[PDB]
């Protein structure tokens, strides 16, 4: 891991480590070779997926092996995925085992063993022939394909005598590479499935759909009786969060205009706010734009309050505007009462949402994981507050187009008179509450992040270095059959070691299950997440 | 068209095109000629088959003057199938019966020797006496590791065959591209034409496309720029037209002058001989503002 | 446009072979790069040639620099002896001066 | 640049055809429209 | 060690676009325990068995 000082292009590093890679290759053992990892982050791991048999003809091999040399280059052609990565199944492989009493009786070495195997597994050039005008080009075989071709190699060759073949010596099978990682779906079984890695800072929703398309439209060329099933997917979050805030940001809009009905005497002067609070944000977007700035979850959550404080200007324009066209009555061209009104009161509104944009700079002020991860909320704050400032000073042709208080102000006169008349006690009772405020300052600690929850579970349990490759997969199963237990659990996906990928670097004996749960509508009377867990 | 009826010459399909246009053709798309078509699929007999169809419906076209579709499998090969049994009981591997072939049928590169700044390559083969026929083939001297004589016939049996000359792939998929030559008539009439032919006298097959390439791409893109650049225009008009007149009639009344500079213009194109282009799009966007200004000074006055 | 050639040389060996264990795993790599508009590529008794043409709008060097990250990911797939070698820094179009 | 027989001259002569066939059509028919739909407008 | 104990991939058979590994390897009952190491047929340059 080459970490980077903090505000260099990704890009930029890549190329300058890649700079010293080259020099390095030459150095290197015979077969081995450094790889550059992805183009992705932590957050790069999007979807993932299992391809389940639901019948006994395909063995795990030929679930890898598809996955690897189909799905694989299927899934990367897509434009914004950084890679797809492999995990569980088994790969297969020829297996040469030898015989050491029949090496001894014939006399061979392991060298010549291998020589002989290397010198058989190629073809040849067929440089074309000076042949009649029609031309043509030679062509070789050799290429090995069968174990019949791996019995007949010859490995010692006499003059005037036997030669000895690979048979008389080994033998050949196929079989099982040394498993590195392991995945399996419900305590059903083991499964192979694939991982999909999203390049650094790109559209998610996008991707997904189009890889989901892509599947759908691929499933048509499966084997029969092979499935591809889910088991992870940002999509689900993201729609959540995106209907959760719209459906906060309409109640909002709708208690403004139910307040503008009960306070006014059912004007529709609301209609002023609910085209002016809008538009004040699409002006925040736009200058989002324009500097990059990705829409995380918390600047989508903080726009619900940035509106609340915007509403402030609105209403105090429009509760003058109405009270002087009301003040006027006593005494369309004479509406002159509306544009001269909104002025005597349209300096003060800007020079206070100035102050309120202005006084957000020391959230651009810190720098570092904290500036990284807050900085959106800060930003679009700023924007939404600097573009409500415009609008309000613009919004006046909008305020043209378009009991209850007196017990208020019943209330409120004698109150008044009676604080008028202790101005320094009411200064100091303010001081006074100034003061008690220390208390809970020092009780309440102070924590980074809230813990925000995702409709997903991740369990992984701190283990031993020492494990073998078949205990390994039987506490998996036994792991994975336990959480499927639960009655709100709805899918588990199990892994133990790595998904072929350098972003994963899992021992053999590390174990992360991705479990699914059912949706709250669903689970059972009460039943929150912490009792889930 | 001198050129084209001087050097017939039996056996090539003529194209002639300028340098620079004809670089930056197939540098975009890939087919030199101005109107082409890309059979797409998985399978190449499938590919080969369709573009022959296409290739050979092409030709019928009034407007077309030449239509040739690239094979796939126009590769003639001679395969050498090495036994392995036979080859072993003579004792000698495979690599050591083929270097039979990639050396003396052959000629591969050994080394390069030096001469001050210069470097030459050496080469080492047999006789021409033993690449005749494949007959001579079956008939090359093969010294075993045995010290012994025998021929290639003994330990391989050599047959000729067809297969890909060639394997074009556009996107990681085999593709065939058929090049048309139409200089008389238009292009994109030619093309509606050859659509609407393979289209109707044509049948599709599965796991294969036919899609339209060349100058035809860039020309929907352009004309579907143009459709949807011209209310951008319109509006900017209308905008600057109220900010001097400072009212919607008389900006209604000005940018309704426009219709009768289309209908001169295309008047004009027809009167001339030209054909609709990038060109005459951009003529008229630029004859829109001239007509709003006339109708402005009129108007002001 | 902004392409970029990537010209690799098997000694002889059949379209097809060429074209399985060369050009396949380069078309298909390339077409990941950042900003790749398509990828040509056609393979020949002995070469195995791939055009990768960008999006609109794209440093003409910055290209060079993506492809050669994925270059180096991709060579040590590649056969024993086979190595890919980028191409010029010039195109098709170039070709200003020609003499006998 | 319309009646212009050179080096390039294709493609300028394809942009200002339009123009030269459409300054000849919307003058002439403005002359005699603006003032008809003026009158009409002030009435 | 690495070849009859350890068994490294000495090849890889293309198979169209795949392309599997090759093993050599000695059976498991010569590798099974230190025991069996220690016991391991090891063949000399000279054919000498020990």
């Not at chain 1, 020829?94 to 195997?117: F, M, T």
């Not at chain 1, 701190?462 to 998996?476: F, R, Y």
């Amino acid at each position: 891991y080459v970490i980077f000082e903090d505000g260099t292009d990704p890009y930029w590093a890549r190329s300058r480590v890649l700079e010293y890679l080259n020099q390095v290759q030459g150095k290197l053992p015979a077969g081995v070779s450094a790889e550059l990892g992805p183009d992705a982050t932590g957050v790069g791991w999007i979807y993932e997926y299992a391809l389940v048999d639901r019948s006994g003809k395909h063995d795990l091999a030929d679930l890898r092996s598809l996955q690897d040399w189909f799905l694989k280059y299927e899934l990367k052609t897509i434009p914004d995925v950084a890679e797809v990565a492999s995990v569980g199944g088994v790969v297969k492989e020829y297996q040469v085992v030898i015989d050491p009493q029949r090496l001894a009786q014939y006399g061979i070495s392991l060298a010549e063993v291998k020589s002989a195997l290397d010198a058989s597994n190629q073809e040849a050039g067929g440089s074309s022939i000076e042949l009649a005008e029609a031309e043509y080009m030679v062509r070789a075989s050799g290429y090995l394909q069968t174990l019949d071709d791996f019995n007949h190699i010859v490995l010692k060759a006499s003059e005037n005598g036997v030669p000895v073949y690979l048979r008389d010596v080994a033998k050949v099978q196929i079989g099982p590479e040394m498993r590195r990682g392991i995945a399996e779906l419900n305590g059903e079984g083991e499964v192979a499935g694939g991982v999909v890695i999203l390049r650094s800072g790109k559209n998610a929703r996008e991707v997904i759909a189009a890889v989901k398309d892509k599947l759908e439209t691929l499933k048509s060329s499966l084997p029969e009786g092979v499935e591809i099933v889910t088991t992870y997917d940002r999509s689900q979050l993201i729609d959540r969060a995106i209907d959760n805030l719209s459906g906060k940001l309409l109640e909002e809009f709708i208690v403004v205009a139910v307040v503008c009905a009960l306070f006014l005497w059912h004007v529709r002067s609301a209609l002023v706010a609910i085209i002016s609070l809008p538009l004040g944000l699409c002006i925040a977007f736009i200058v989002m734009h324009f500097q990059g700035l990705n829409a995380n979850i918390m600047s989508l959550g903080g726009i619900a309050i940035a509106v609340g404080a915007m509403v402030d200007a609105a209403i105090v324009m429009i509760e003058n505007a109405h009270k002087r066209l009301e003040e006027w009555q006593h005494q369309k061209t004479r509406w002159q009462v509306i544009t001269d009104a909104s002025v005597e009161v349209g300096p003060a509104l800007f020079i206070s949402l100035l102050i309120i944009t202005l006084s957000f700079i020391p959230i651009f002020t810190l720098e570092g994981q904290e500036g990284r991860l807050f900085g959106p909320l800060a930003f679009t704050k700023t924007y939404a507050m600097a573009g409500a400032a415009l609008l309000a000073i613009v919004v006046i042709p909008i305020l043209m187009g378009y009991p209850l208080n007196r017990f208020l102000i019943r209330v409120y006169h004698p109150l008044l008179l009676k604080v008028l008349h202790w101005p320094k006690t009411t200064l100091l009772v303010a001081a006074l509450s100034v003061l008690t405020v220390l208390w809970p300052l020092n009780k309440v600690g102070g924590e980074f992040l809230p813990q925000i929850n995702e409709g997903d579970l991740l369990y992984m349990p701190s283990t031993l270095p020492g494990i073998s490759a078949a205990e390994a997969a039987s506490m998996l199963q036994k792991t994975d059959k336990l959480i499927m237990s639960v009655p709100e659990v709805a899918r588990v996906f199990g892994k133990t070691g790595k998904a072929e990928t350098a972003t994963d670097s899992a021992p053999l004996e590390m174990v992360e299950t991705t479990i699914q749960l059912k949706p709250q509508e669903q689970w059972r009377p009460g039943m929150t997440m912490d009792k889930i867990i | 068209e001198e050129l084209d009826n001087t050097v017939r010459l039996p056996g090539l399909a003529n194209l002639w095109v300028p340098p620079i246009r004809n670089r930056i053709d197939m540098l975009s798309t890939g087919i030199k000629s101005p109107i082409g078509i890309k059979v797409s699929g998985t399978v190449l007999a499938d590919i080969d088959a369709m573009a022959e169809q296409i290739e050979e419906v092409a030709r019928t076209v009034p407007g077309v003057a030449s239509a040739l579709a690239e094979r796939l499998e126009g590769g003639r090969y001679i395969n050498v199938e090495i036994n392995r049994e036979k080859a072993a009981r003579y004792g000698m591997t495979v690599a050591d019966v083929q270097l039979f072939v990639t050396s003396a049928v052959g000629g591969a590169m050994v080394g390069e020797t030096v001469e001050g700044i210069a470097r030459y390559p050496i080469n080492l083969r047999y006789p021409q006496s033993w690449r005749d026929s494949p007959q001579a083939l079956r008939q090359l001297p093969i010294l075993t590791p045995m010290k012994q004589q025998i021929t290639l016939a003994d330990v391989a049996d050599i047959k000729v065959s067809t297969g890909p000359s060639m394997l074009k792939t556009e996107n990681a998929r085999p593709t065939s591209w058929i090049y048309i030559d139409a200089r008389d008539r238009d292009m994109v009439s030619v093309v509606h034409d050859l659509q609407k032919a393979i289209a109707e006298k044509v049948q599709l097959k599965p796991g294969t496309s036919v899609a339209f390439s060349g100058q035809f791409e860039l020309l929907e893109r352009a004309n579907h720029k143009l459709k949807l650049m011209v209310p951008m225009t319109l509006m900017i008009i209308f905008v600057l037209l109220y900010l001097a007149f400072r009212r919607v009639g008389e900006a209604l009344l000005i940018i309704s002058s426009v219709p009768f500079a289309l209908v001169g213009g295309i008047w004009l194109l027809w009167w001339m001989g030209f054909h609709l282009s990038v060109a005459t799009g951009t003529g008229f966007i630029a004859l829109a503002g001239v007509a709003a200004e006339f109708g402005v000074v009129m108007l002001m006055y | 446009d902004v392409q970029v050639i990537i010209k690799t040389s098997y000694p002889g060996q059949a379209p097809q072979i060429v074209e399985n264990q060369v050009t396949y795993p380069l078309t298909t790599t390339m077409l990941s790069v950042p900003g790749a508009k398509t990828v040509r590529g056609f393979s020949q008794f002995g070469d195995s040639y791939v055009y990768v043409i960008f999006e609109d709008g794209t440093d003409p060097y910055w290209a060079r620099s993506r492809v050669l990250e994925y270059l180096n990911q991709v060579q040590g797939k590649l056969p024993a002896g086979v190595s890919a070698e980028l191409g010029p820094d010039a195109t098709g179009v170039g070709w200003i001066y020609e003499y006998a | 640049i319309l009646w212009g027989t050179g080096a390039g001259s294709e493609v300028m002569s394809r942009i200002a055809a339009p123009m030269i066939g459409g300054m000849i059509t919307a003058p002439l028919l403005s002359l005699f429209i603006i003032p008809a739909a003026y009158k009409l407008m002030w009435l």
